[model samples]
Target: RPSLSPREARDRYLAHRQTDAADASIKSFRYRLKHFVEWAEERDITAMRELTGWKLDEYETFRRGSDVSPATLNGEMQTLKNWLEYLARIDVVDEDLPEKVHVP
Candidate 1:
């Protein structure tokens, strides 16, 4: 995330994913990313390196506390993973970080 704040990175990623996207795709991408941006904002994350696996886990645990079913949990985790995926795509996060989130 070079000098980009989490918000900037997020918006950039969302727009990147928006490439020739359908309205549904745009909606899903934004909706999926909302949780991470909210948590990152609260944590005051200003850059990609600032978001460690530890922080990722903390957010996961926080979401886990919501008592959602397994399918829902997988969806949220996949969203977080997708966020990482795009961030890596733009060279914001280190390459190793994107493929690291749990999907199942």
Candidate 2:
């Protein structure tokens, strides 16, 4: 329920990542979220609240189909979980939503 749209809200998260020491992981998350953001945009999912738990599940399923390695999968989920946690911290998404970004 932010005054800004979900897309706008994500910018703050990205900005925070820019200053973090764990930037490699953050960059990975940013990369993954980029594709996800595109998908969300195409679906007109502009509101922060519109990013549903099921959407995370759907994205996980999509990524699994790409035939990636387990470590790679884990890293992707790491990015997702961290990003979702930040979104929740900023009141854009539910705090528990990060748990929904499960591993395969």
Candidate 3:
């Protein structure tokens, strides 16, 4: 079967969260992924293969330019990192795409 589109993957992830009774985290996760999708698409990155730690850092820098607070960016990065891990678990993306790093 073909891999899910970003939007489809997000919807399915949300649905899974709901089914697992994880409503609060799911809501926040959905919001975070929405931003991720928009950011990725704006850069012509259409699929999971396009995601990379460098791209994530760039996105964080862009967010910082918009005056987003460091704490906020940190949270967003964590959310995106977790989402990428989820994608990897399902084989939709390579596991090492989101590199682990110290925020400080």
**Winning model by TM-score:** 1
Give the whole-model CA lDDT for all candidates, comma-separated. 0.77, 0.73, 0.70
Report, for all candidates in order, the number of backbone clashes: 1, 0, 0
| lDDT digits (tens) for residues 1-104 of candidate 1 | 35567778778877877877887877876876777788888888868667777787888888888777878788878877887877777677878886667676
Reference-based TM-score of each model: 0.83, 0.78, 0.78
lDDT per residue for candidate 3 within 1-104, as digits (tens), equals 24766776677667766766577788878877788678777788767666667777787777667766788777777877766677778877777875652242
Whose lDDT is higher: candidate 2's or candidate 3's?
2
Clash total of candidate 3: 0
Q: Which candidate, 1 or 3, has the higher TM-score? A: 1
Ten-residue stretch with the least lDDT total in model 1: 1-10
Candidate order (TM-score): 1, 3, 2
Off by over 4 Å in 1: none
lDDT score of residue 38 within candidate 2: 72
Q: Between candidates 1 and 2, which one is better according to lDDT?
A: 1
